[PDB]
Amino acid sequence: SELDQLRQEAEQLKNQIRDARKACADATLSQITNNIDPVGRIQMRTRRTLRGHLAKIYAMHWGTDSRLLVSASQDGKLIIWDSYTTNKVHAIPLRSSWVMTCAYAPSGNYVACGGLDNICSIYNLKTREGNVRVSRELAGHTGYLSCCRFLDDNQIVTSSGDTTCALWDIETGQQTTTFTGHTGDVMSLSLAPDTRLFVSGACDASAKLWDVREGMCRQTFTGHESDINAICFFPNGNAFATGSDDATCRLFDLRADQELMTYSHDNIICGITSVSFSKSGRLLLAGYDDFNCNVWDALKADRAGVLAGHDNRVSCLGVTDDGMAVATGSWDSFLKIWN
């Protein structure tokens, strides 16, 4: 028939992929790094307890000045904080209460966000008035917006629960390009440093990779037993990490095109909600549902420490562009800055 040929010709390809994957699997990262020195016992202390949000925090993000951060809550707001002062530069009450994600434009000018509203909304902070306005309301998706990221002030990229991602012209306000492939809800996305490529991670238990200007997927990555809640680029634009519901994190490589490491423990039973790399790549920080955040050695996969401040679930996190700090938001309603 025509169906069975084009479903087995897929396995023939998936095998040809899985063979070329194993061909490249000469050693484990764990072996390659077995000898290099332990990071030590990384004990970070809570430095800023940022109170303000009134119920669960769900997402946050840092500006390019390495100081101003935007965050999103169950309480229905964006708070553009200044992490140094612990003070709020903008509180932007939102048109929709179900906010899940938020972003910050590289220029410092615009921010964006969304959630169960199925909209990515752009906010201009350079009005003549001297306040915040909504320049564009980018509509076109059909499921919950779960992540978004500006490339420049004319253009932006978005991921959603409808199982798609997309690039927008903000001037005309239309999707310049659209990105399909995924089969369960998309949860997170990460741009590259050059911003010609980006990556998505989903409840399908897989992650994917796209050329911005062509308009099509290049590479797809699996391994986890359960939902991938989080994704982040390795600093050089050639690998990325993941957080998952199966009680483990994982690293994947773009040119090698496969899984390098798994971060886990017999004591640890709960799931993972967020991942960020330190500026170099060496620490992988992850947030859990036993109320702690664990610092993993990215290369050795040892439990390097416990950020054990929060009294409920850790939900989001981020590392600065200058590497100075790690922010953790929780279900207990507080952000914390650590270093």
Partner: protein
Amino acid sequence: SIAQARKLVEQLKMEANIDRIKVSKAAADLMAYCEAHAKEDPLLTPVPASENPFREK
């Protein structure tokens, strides 16, 4: 679902035709970047209270 499989074969065709380096090498480029930029990574290298915006001022 005539197009659904025809897309998947076209797509996997794309995902196969890419020049793939290897895990020992990739692991070493990751390690090469880590080691290289490790100086300027505050979370590994305990930078003193002066250098840290979140310690004193």
